[PDB]
């Protein structure tokens, strides 16, 4: 019961709809771990649904800072509001797989009909998505992830340190 997952990226947020569930007990087995590595089987387990790209470098930077501190940004708020179905706020909440335990509560207190998950299974799904990366986007236009990462890392670190031209 892992209906959706959220994946943050240097160029914006992505949201995937889980199609099948890998069996929960067998997860430590050679066979399911290999299907996470392989690309053919990961597509059977996951299809992308949404992708909101960041506006510019500054907006990406502050968004990464808020992800670090564990808050929800305006952009994340919007994309979740758009993708996630509205179930009853009392029974049958919708399951979303995130990467950060500390991100959980903020998402909840913004969306009381969603339930975050960071399990062994959800961490495996995040890992597979991160491994395959751009092949999963079916061609949706994304910046070069590696250059994005270099720029973002440098900006993040300079921000924390207070690097100065003086």
């Amino acid at each position: 019961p892992i209906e959706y997952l959220l994946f943050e990226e240097p160029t914006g947020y992505a949201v995937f709809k889980v199609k099948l569930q890998q069996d929960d007990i067998g997860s430590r087995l050679k066979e399911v771990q290999e299907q996470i590595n392989d690309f053919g089987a990961f597509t059977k387990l996951i299809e992308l649904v949404s992708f909101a790209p960041f506006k510019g470098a500054a907006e990406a930077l502050e968004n990464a800072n808020d992800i670090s501190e564990g808050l929800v940004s305006e952009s994340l708020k919007a994309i979740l509001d758009l993708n996630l179905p509205k179930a009853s706020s009392k029974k049958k909440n919708i399951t979303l797989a995130i990467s950060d335990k500390n991100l959980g509560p903020s998402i909840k207190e913004e969306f009381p009909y969603v339930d975050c998950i960071s399990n062994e299974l959800a961490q495996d799904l995040i890992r597979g998505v991160r491994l395959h990366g751009e092949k999963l986007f079916k061609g949706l236009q994304s910046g070069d992830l590696e250059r994005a990462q270099l720029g973002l890392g440098h900006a993040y670190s300079r921000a924390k340190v207070k690097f100065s031209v003086q």
Partner: protein, 461 residues
């Protein structure tokens, strides 16, 4: 003189591109595909050979185990990772089976842990978080019942109160436990079965035929107010909770160790019984067993229904596990290891895929329900081929070659020898009975399904 011949367009058959996939014309003309029976027979025979060379049951064990043999297992009927095991040491653990790890490990009681239930209470003081914590209920031999909390990582949705929420003192030594679902109401069989509520420290209701202790209990899955119980004057007693009273009683020739309803029929149960057998009963007509499951060689110790409702898994005091289908009456499959002994508890998994077995060498192993079905996701082509395999071998199941191959399973020498001895004794009984029949006049043809009931209380017709 209008004529034409077979002309092929190589453009149509051999594609212009290189990546484009050439087409495969098909013609279902029967005279074009010549051998049906022989071809399909050999496909089925190869299929069973492959089954035999792919049967790899054992999938792994749960951490380092228990110190002193496992005697209580309780799966969480809600989730799928979680089970709770308990040992004659007195130490109960709450396992995460996805990682083969343990959440906690409480030293619960001074004596044995005789029962475990896993649940969520319905407190009236508050509503304990069903999402951050699970709850567990141990039923001990030193006259106590304890309710524990477990911190479970299932959801990531918060950020104290770790263990032993509550303790229920008893007057007797408790001997089995189960918890009526969707009501938060448990029932414990010691010297007289008590219906307890979570919020009251005094047993709410007394249910007992007479003055006999009660070995074990189990509620049923559907129509959930029907409880069944097994007592040590080798009796099986159905209770109902809406009228709040015992309902009926059957007495067999030997004590029944455990009972499981089935979760798809709601009035059938199956009892693991010490005369090496498992008897499958209808509830409304308790005079006779629907079926008898046979192939054990020492006391059967536990049974469980697959949630699909069609298979049974039994574990005996002989050191092996057997899997049965509800309609046959002989073992589909036998699981056995040199390192597993006196299977005392068996639980079949809520995805129907696996089997957990607690054994008194102190270990909680877990096995595959069908020894083939790898857990990975299968491409549609492969999936179709596998389902085709299964259909073909179900079709040709009884041909002598295929039967020889797919029934050859290796069994420990103790079980082989015990089985041939038991066959000898049954032949002996049967032919002395034959001679007695040859002479005497009046002996009933006592049926194989009524042979095993000493007597019922409420006689009907």
């Amino acid at each position: 003189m209008k004529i034409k011949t077979i002309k092929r367009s190589a453009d149509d058959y051999v594609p212009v591109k290189s990546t484009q996939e050439s087409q495969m014309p098909r013609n279902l003309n029967p005279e074009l595909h010549p051998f049906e029976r022989a071809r399909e027979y050999t496909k089925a025979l190869n299929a069973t050979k492959l089954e035999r060379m792919f049967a790899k049951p054992f999938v792994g064990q749960l951490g380092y185990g228990h110190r002193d043999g496992v005697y209580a297992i309780a799966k969480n009927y809600g989730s799928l990772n979680k089970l709770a095991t308990g040992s004659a040491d007195g130490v109960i653990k709450y396992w995460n089976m996805s990682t083969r790890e343990e959440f906690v490990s409480f030293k619960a009681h001074y004596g044995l842990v005789t029962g475990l239930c896993v649940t969520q209470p319905r407190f009236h003081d508050k509503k304990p978080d069903l999402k951050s914590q699970n709850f567990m209920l141990s039923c001990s031999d030193d006259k106590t019942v304890k309710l524990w909390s477990i911190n479970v990582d299932d959801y990531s949705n918060k950020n104290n109160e770790e263990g032993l929420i509550r303790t229920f003192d008893g007057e007797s030594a408790f001997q089995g436990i189960d918890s009526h679902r969707e009501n938060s109401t448990f029932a414990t069989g010691g010297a007289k079965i008590h219906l307890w509520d979570v919020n009251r420290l005094k047993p709410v209701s007394d249910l007992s035929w007479g003055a006999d202790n009660i070995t074990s209990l189990k509620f049923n899955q559907n129509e959930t107010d029907i409880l069944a119980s097994t007592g040590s004057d080798n009796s099986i007693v159905l209770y109902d909770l809406r009228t709040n009273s015992p309902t009926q009683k059957i007495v067999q020739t030997m004590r029944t160790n455990a009972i499981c309803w089935n979760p798809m029929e709601a009035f059938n149960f199956v009892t693991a019984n010490e005369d090496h057998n498992a008897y499958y009963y209808d509830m409304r007509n308790l005079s006779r067993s629907l079926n008898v499951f046979k192939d054990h060689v020492s006391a059967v110790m536990d049974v469980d229904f697959s949630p699909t409702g069609d298979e049974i898994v039994t574990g005996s005091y002989d050191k092996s596990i057997r899997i049965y289908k509800t309609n046959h009456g002989h073992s589909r499959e036998i699981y056995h290891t040199k390192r597993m002994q006196h299977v005392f508890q068996v639980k079949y998994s809520m995805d129907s895929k696996y089997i957990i077995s607690g054994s008194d060498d102190g270990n909680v192993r877990l096995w595959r329900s069908k020894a083939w079905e790898r857990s990975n996701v299968k491409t549609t082509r492969e999936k179709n081929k596998l389902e085709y395999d299964e259909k073909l071998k179900e079709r040709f199941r009884h041909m002598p070659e295929i039967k020889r191959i797919s029934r050859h399973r290796h069994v420990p020498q103790v079980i082989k020898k015990a089985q041939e001895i038991k066959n000898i004794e049954l032949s002996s009984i049967k032919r002395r009975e034959a001679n007695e029949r040859r002479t005497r006049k009046d002996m009933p043809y006592i049926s194989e399904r009524k042979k095993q009931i000493v007597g019922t209380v409420h006689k009907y017709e």
